[PDB]
Design a protein around this ligand. Structure first.
Ligand SMILES: [Zn+2]
Ligand SMILES: [Zn+2]
Lengths: 42, 123, 70, 48, 102, 101, 66
């Protein structure tokens, strides 16, 4: 059920910002020059 | 057979988080460790019932929510010469403790537990 | 004819820039549907592009042609 | 307080949690409204 | 009371259910103001989409602990979340399905 | 050849003879050039697909060395594998600092 | 919302259809805008027994306040 007691840090934990996360996989990186220069100049 | 969690330590800060709906982070200072924990407003209401302050040894059960105060810690014994609050030493061991019980309980006791409310510390 | 000086600048402003509505941008309620068959029962924006896809055949047809950011 | 502190030993060893909230009708979902449980929990929170 | 206890009534209705594997969770709140803004990605065998969340979805998403590896099944009418399995889960079928409850 | 029955592209006899005449050891096994052509075929296929998609990004049907330079430098395992390798006519990455803006 | 003048009861229908595109998934259903005017009147020929008026005169039944 719902736990009435919750362990928590002072510096890492904030009550407002809640975040939860976990052939070859590779993140998609755009090789376009105008895309990277368009991202860095905006 | 069931396992329960045991928390104990000296109360350092009673303060809201940073913004709020009024919950309280209770920083329990044990001997072998220091940890901060966030509690429900009902167990915080029983904490307000026990009249604890900064530097008081408490006993808090996780699954049940019952609160028992042991007394003022031995570090504040020299603050006043005479005090009605007894001075207990700091609890040895960790902050979080676990144990298992082979407690027997009759089925009729579970029927009365399923029938009518028995007690609690809230209104 | 637009490059010619036979028409006034106020004539071009009245003919082109003044007929369009200025204050009212949106009055009616906005409706987001799927980009394949328009399913509003399943509103589900995609991952790489964020495009709203309702059903499973809409995604299997979405991965091949209509996904540019993949 | 001394007779109470010395002679009260036994505990109701069997209980059902979250039955205290349901017995009065104040929980996360019930037939009562939203600030009935809030104003009742505050007037309870003040009265000792 | 016994004569009223002997006879029963069957009432049926239909509800919608979305069951699929979570890829990642990205909520957004503020340190002073509030007003949480949740986003997560739901994936299955033939569908993978990002779902933006409301206030009560982050209320039930933060009152009940969940991870990216953990997999949810959400009813729209009930508003409560079923955190079924983590990456038991091994799901098949379509993402959003409607079934009848009696 | 034994490359087609094993699912290989690079020849086993050239690598085995190169390991024989390369002054490495006295005895050479039979599975070592097959393993070496497997690793070199997988790595060369990796650079071919990363430089192929890098050529697909700039809308060109030919691979310039800048596409291979961005394909190698944009990957973490290729940059950690080859950190001192200088590629001719590959250029540099568009790295613009934030404080100079 | 739905608000009755003489009784004071409040029922919510849901979020309007104009804010359906604000979020992609929301537990609050999206209902269209109610047609017609703001103020409406009608007459009922509702029958109610005199004993029901006696129970209505005897004990409080229930309200939305505390
Ligand atoms: Zn569709
Ligand atoms: Zn897509």
């Amino acid at each position: 059920m719902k736990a009435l007691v919750e362990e928590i840090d002072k510096k890492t934990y904030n009550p407002d910002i809640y975040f939860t996360s976990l052939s070859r996989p590779v993140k998609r990186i755009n090789y376009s020059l105008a895309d990277l220069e368009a991202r860095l100049y905006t | 057979k069931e396992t329960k969690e045991v928390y104990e330590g000296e109360v350092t800060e009673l303060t809201p988080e940073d913004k709020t709906i009024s919950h309280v982070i209770v920083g329990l200072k044990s001997a072998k460790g220091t940890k901060t924990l966030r509690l429900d407003p009902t167990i915080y209401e029983s904490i307000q019932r026990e009249k604890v302050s900064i530097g008081d040894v408490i006993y808090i059960e996780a699954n049940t929510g019952a609160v028992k105060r042991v007394g003022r810690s031995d570090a504040y014994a020299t603050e006043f010469d005479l005090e009605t609050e007894e001075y207990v030493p700091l609890p040895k061991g960790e902050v979080h403790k676990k144990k298992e019980i082979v407690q027997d309980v009759t089925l009729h006791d579970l029927d009365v537990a399923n029938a009518r409310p028995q007690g609690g510390q809230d209104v | 004819f637009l490059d010619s000086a036979l028409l006034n600048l106020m004539d071009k402003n009245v003919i082109y820039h003044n007929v369009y509505n200025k204050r009212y941008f949106k009055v009616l309620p906005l409706i987001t549907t799927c980009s394949i068959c328009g399913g509003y029962d399943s509103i589900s924006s995609c991952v790489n592009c964020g495009n709203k896809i309702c059903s499973v055949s809409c995604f299997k047809l979405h991965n091949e042609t209509r996904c540019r950011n993949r | 307080r001394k007779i109470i502190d010395t002679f009260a030993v036994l505990t109701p060893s069997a209980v059902s949690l979250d039955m205290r909230k349901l017995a009065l009708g104040l929980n996360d979902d019930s037939s009562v409204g939203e600030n009935t449980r809030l104003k009742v929990m505050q007037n309870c929170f003040e009265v000792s | 009371q016994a004569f009223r206890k002997s006879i029963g009534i069957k009432i049926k209705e239909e509800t919608e259910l979305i069951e699929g594997e979570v890829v990642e969770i990205q909520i957004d709140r503020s340190i002073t103001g509030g007003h949480k803004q949740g986003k997560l990605t739901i994936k299955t065998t033939d569908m993978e989409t990002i779902y933006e969340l409301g206030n009560k979805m982050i209320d039930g998403l933060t009152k009940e602990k969940v991870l990216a590896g953990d997999v949810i099944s959400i009813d729209k009418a009930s508003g409560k979340i079923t955190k079924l399995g983590r990456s038991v889960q091994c799901p098949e079928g379509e993402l959003q399905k409607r079934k009848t409850v009696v | 050849s034994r490359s087609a029955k094993a699912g290989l592209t690079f020849p086993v006899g050239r690598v085995h003879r190169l390991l024989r005449r390369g002054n490495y050891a006295q005895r050479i096994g039979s599975g070592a050039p097959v393993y070496l052509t497997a690793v070199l075929e997988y790595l060369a296929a990796e650079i071919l697909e990363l430089a192929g998609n890098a050529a697909r990004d700039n809308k060109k049907t030919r691979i310039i060395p800048r596409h291979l330079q961005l394909a190698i430098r944009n990957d973490d395992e290729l940059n950690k594998l080859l950190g001192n390798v200088t590629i001719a006519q590959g250029g540099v990455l568009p790295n613009i600092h934030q404080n100079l803006l």
